[PDB]
Amino acid sequence: LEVYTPKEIFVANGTQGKLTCKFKSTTGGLTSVSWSFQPEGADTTVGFFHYSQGQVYLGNYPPFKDRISWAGDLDKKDASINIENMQFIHNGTYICDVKNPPDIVGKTSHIRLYVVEKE
């Protein structure tokens, strides 16, 4: 198992952010995806999205309410999510955690997401 995300993305504020994740494995069924957020300048992280067995599970982080959608396809080894109407409160590091049985405990990749003035 190997997990890729871009190192950085820049998103114009008010537009949709695409958090790309691609992985390699020998998929679907037991495989799961979690995404977490570390707000810039905090040392804590919020888990806010989880996907297994065709079902989306959403954490309660008010900045992400009504913004998070699954954009992946496990068969295509894509674990991406979209984030609507991105604003400066969404600046920080996004962390994708992919578990594929069998792997010992899974793998993670980080995106530093910079929201940028659309003006």
PDB file of C-alpha atoms in Angstrom:
ATOM      1  CA  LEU A   1       0.000   0.000   0.000  1.00  0.00           C
ATOM      2  CA  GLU A   2       1.170   3.490  -0.967  1.00  0.00           C
ATOM      3  CA  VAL A   3      -0.876   6.681  -0.624  1.00  0.00           C
ATOM      4  CA  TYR A   4      -0.415   9.855  -2.670  1.00  0.00           C
ATOM      5  CA  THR A   5      -1.805  13.331  -2.210  1.00  0.00           C
ATOM      6  CA  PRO A   6      -0.342  16.511  -3.691  1.00  0.00           C
ATOM      7  CA  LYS A   7       1.919  18.314  -1.288  1.00  0.00           C
ATOM      8  CA  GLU A   8       0.093  21.620  -1.634  1.00  0.00           C
ATOM      9  CA  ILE A   9      -3.001  22.917  -3.291  1.00  0.00           C
ATOM     10  CA  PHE A  10      -4.171  26.479  -3.776  1.00  0.00           C
ATOM     11  CA  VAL A  11      -7.925  27.092  -3.839  1.00  0.00           C
ATOM     12  CA  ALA A  12      -9.587  30.397  -4.721  1.00  0.00           C
ATOM     13  CA  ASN A  13     -11.917  31.360  -1.885  1.00  0.00           C
ATOM     14  CA  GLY A  14     -15.567  30.753  -2.687  1.00  0.00           C
ATOM     15  CA  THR A  15     -14.754  27.899  -5.084  1.00  0.00           C
ATOM     16  CA  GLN A  16     -14.639  24.100  -4.794  1.00  0.00           C
ATOM     17  CA  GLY A  17     -11.489  22.401  -3.497  1.00  0.00           C
ATOM     18  CA  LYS A  18     -10.633  18.971  -4.881  1.00  0.00           C
ATOM     19  CA  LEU A  19      -8.550  16.981  -2.377  1.00  0.00           C
ATOM     20  CA  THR A  20      -6.940  14.365  -4.606  1.00  0.00           C
ATOM     21  CA  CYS A  21      -5.857  11.035  -3.206  1.00  0.00           C
ATOM     22  CA  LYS A  22      -4.489   8.157  -5.301  1.00  0.00           C
ATOM     23  CA  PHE A  23      -3.224   4.904  -3.845  1.00  0.00           C
ATOM     24  CA  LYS A  24      -1.612   1.667  -4.980  1.00  0.00           C
ATOM     25  CA  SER A  25      -2.568  -1.776  -3.696  1.00  0.00           C
ATOM     26  CA  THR A  26      -3.244  -5.312  -4.871  1.00  0.00           C
ATOM     27  CA  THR A  27      -9.754  -3.293  -4.213  1.00  0.00           C
ATOM     28  CA  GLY A  28     -12.788  -1.939  -2.421  1.00  0.00           C
ATOM     29  CA  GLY A  29     -14.490  -4.119   0.103  1.00  0.00           C
ATOM     30  CA  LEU A  30     -12.430  -4.095   3.193  1.00  0.00           C
ATOM     31  CA  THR A  31     -10.724  -0.881   2.166  1.00  0.00           C
ATOM     32  CA  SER A  32     -11.603   2.339   3.930  1.00  0.00           C
ATOM     33  CA  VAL A  33     -10.724   6.044   3.743  1.00  0.00           C
ATOM     34  CA  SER A  34     -10.624   8.730   6.463  1.00  0.00           C
ATOM     35  CA  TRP A  35      -9.877  12.424   5.995  1.00  0.00           C
ATOM     36  CA  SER A  36      -8.836  14.713   8.858  1.00  0.00           C
ATOM     37  CA  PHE A  37      -8.108  18.448   9.188  1.00  0.00           C
ATOM     38  CA  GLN A  38      -5.466  20.334  11.168  1.00  0.00           C
ATOM     39  CA  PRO A  39      -6.398  24.044  11.159  1.00  0.00           C
ATOM     40  CA  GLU A  40      -3.374  26.164  10.397  1.00  0.00           C
ATOM     41  CA  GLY A  41      -1.671  27.158  13.621  1.00  0.00           C
ATOM     42  CA  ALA A  42      -3.308  24.516  15.801  1.00  0.00           C
ATOM     43  CA  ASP A  43      -1.742  21.297  17.053  1.00  0.00           C
ATOM     44  CA  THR A  44      -4.987  19.303  17.032  1.00  0.00           C
ATOM     45  CA  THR A  45      -6.717  17.533  14.167  1.00  0.00           C
ATOM     46  CA  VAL A  46     -10.394  16.818  13.496  1.00  0.00           C
ATOM     47  CA  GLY A  47     -11.510  13.648  11.752  1.00  0.00           C
ATOM     48  CA  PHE A  48     -14.395  14.730   9.523  1.00  0.00           C
ATOM     49  CA  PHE A  49     -14.941  12.179   6.706  1.00  0.00           C
ATOM     50  CA  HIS A  50     -14.910   8.379   6.581  1.00  0.00           C
ATOM     51  CA  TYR A  51     -15.855   5.949   3.814  1.00  0.00           C
ATOM     52  CA  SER A  52     -16.229   2.172   3.834  1.00  0.00           C
ATOM     53  CA  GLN A  53     -18.507  -0.230   1.985  1.00  0.00           C
ATOM     54  CA  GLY A  54     -20.086   2.436  -0.189  1.00  0.00           C
ATOM     55  CA  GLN A  55     -21.260   4.554   2.788  1.00  0.00           C
ATOM     56  CA  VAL A  56     -20.114   8.085   3.692  1.00  0.00           C
ATOM     57  CA  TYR A  57     -19.790   8.976   7.391  1.00  0.00           C
ATOM     58  CA  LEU A  58     -19.362  12.639   8.369  1.00  0.00           C
ATOM     59  CA  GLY A  59     -17.918  14.131  11.536  1.00  0.00           C
ATOM     60  CA  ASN A  60     -19.420  17.249  13.091  1.00  0.00           C
ATOM     61  CA  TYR A  61     -16.986  20.050  12.357  1.00  0.00           C
ATOM     62  CA  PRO A  62     -19.186  23.098  11.760  1.00  0.00           C
ATOM     63  CA  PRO A  63     -16.811  24.658   9.169  1.00  0.00           C
ATOM     64  CA  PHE A  64     -17.353  21.549   7.011  1.00  0.00           C
ATOM     65  CA  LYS A  65     -21.128  21.272   7.480  1.00  0.00           C
ATOM     66  CA  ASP A  66     -22.845  20.906   4.091  1.00  0.00           C
ATOM     67  CA  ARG A  67     -19.535  21.105   2.190  1.00  0.00           C
ATOM     68  CA  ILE A  68     -18.012  17.603   2.078  1.00  0.00           C
ATOM     69  CA  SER A  69     -18.672  15.103  -0.680  1.00  0.00           C
ATOM     70  CA  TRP A  70     -17.095  11.820  -1.709  1.00  0.00           C
ATOM     71  CA  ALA A  71     -15.231  12.213  -4.986  1.00  0.00           C
ATOM     72  CA  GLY A  72     -13.406   8.902  -5.136  1.00  0.00           C
ATOM     73  CA  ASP A  73     -13.769   5.433  -6.551  1.00  0.00           C
ATOM     74  CA  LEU A  74     -12.147   2.615  -4.623  1.00  0.00           C
ATOM     75  CA  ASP A  75     -12.125   0.411  -7.701  1.00  0.00           C
ATOM     76  CA  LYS A  76     -10.090   3.107  -9.411  1.00  0.00           C
ATOM     77  CA  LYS A  77      -8.007   3.417  -6.296  1.00  0.00           C
ATOM     78  CA  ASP A  78      -9.117   7.064  -5.909  1.00  0.00           C
ATOM     79  CA  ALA A  79      -9.864   8.326  -2.343  1.00  0.00           C
ATOM     80  CA  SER A  80     -10.595  11.981  -3.224  1.00  0.00           C
ATOM     81  CA  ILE A  81     -13.162  14.296  -1.612  1.00  0.00           C
ATOM     82  CA  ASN A  82     -14.519  17.692  -2.669  1.00  0.00           C
ATOM     83  CA  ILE A  83     -15.015  20.714  -0.390  1.00  0.00           C
ATOM     84  CA  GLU A  84     -17.537  23.368  -1.452  1.00  0.00           C
ATOM     85  CA  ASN A  85     -17.206  27.118  -1.066  1.00  0.00           C
ATOM     86  CA  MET A  86     -13.796  27.118   0.556  1.00  0.00           C
ATOM     87  CA  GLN A  87     -12.917  29.995   2.857  1.00  0.00           C
ATOM     88  CA  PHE A  88     -10.002  31.130   4.948  1.00  0.00           C
ATOM     89  CA  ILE A  89     -11.287  29.126   7.935  1.00  0.00           C
ATOM     90  CA  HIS A  90     -10.442  25.987   5.893  1.00  0.00           C
ATOM     91  CA  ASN A  91      -6.711  26.821   5.692  1.00  0.00           C
ATOM     92  CA  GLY A  92      -4.563  24.052   7.090  1.00  0.00           C
ATOM     93  CA  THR A  93      -3.324  20.512   6.565  1.00  0.00           C
ATOM     94  CA  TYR A  94      -5.622  17.751   5.283  1.00  0.00           C
ATOM     95  CA  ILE A  95      -4.716  14.140   6.035  1.00  0.00           C
ATOM     96  CA  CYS A  96      -5.939  11.098   4.095  1.00  0.00           C
ATOM     97  CA  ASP A  97      -5.733   7.723   5.854  1.00  0.00           C
ATOM     98  CA  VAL A  98      -6.220   4.630   3.660  1.00  0.00           C
ATOM     99  CA  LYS A  99      -6.634   1.167   5.139  1.00  0.00           C
ATOM    100  CA  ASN A 100      -6.577  -1.847   2.908  1.00  0.00           C
ATOM    101  CA  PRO A 101      -6.742  -5.353   4.350  1.00  0.00           C
ATOM    102  CA  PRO A 102      -4.276  -6.675   4.501  1.00  0.00           C
ATOM    103  CA  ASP A 103      -1.878  -3.987   5.568  1.00  0.00           C
ATOM    104  CA  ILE A 104      -0.521  -3.710   9.078  1.00  0.00           C
ATOM    105  CA  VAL A 105      -2.141  -0.384  10.086  1.00  0.00           C
ATOM    106  CA  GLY A 106      -2.588   1.642   6.879  1.00  0.00           C
ATOM    107  CA  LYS A 107      -0.910   4.695   5.327  1.00  0.00           C
ATOM    108  CA  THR A 108      -1.390   8.476   5.426  1.00  0.00           C
ATOM    109  CA  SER A 109      -0.548  11.432   3.195  1.00  0.00           C
ATOM    110  CA  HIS A 110      -0.827  15.168   3.913  1.00  0.00           C
ATOM    111  CA  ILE A 111      -2.041  18.106   1.818  1.00  0.00           C
ATOM    112  CA  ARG A 112      -1.208  21.669   2.811  1.00  0.00           C
ATOM    113  CA  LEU A 113      -4.241  23.559   1.525  1.00  0.00           C
ATOM    114  CA  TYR A 114      -3.893  27.331   0.967  1.00  0.00           C
ATOM    115  CA  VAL A 115      -7.021  29.304   0.281  1.00  0.00           C
ATOM    116  CA  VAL A 116      -6.246  32.296  -1.848  1.00  0.00           C
ATOM    117  CA  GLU A 117      -8.000  35.592  -2.540  1.00  0.00           C
ATOM    118  CA  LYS A 118     -10.188  35.190  -5.620  1.00  0.00           C
ATOM    119  CA  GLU A 119     -10.022  38.994  -6.054  1.00  0.00           C
TER     120      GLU A 119
END
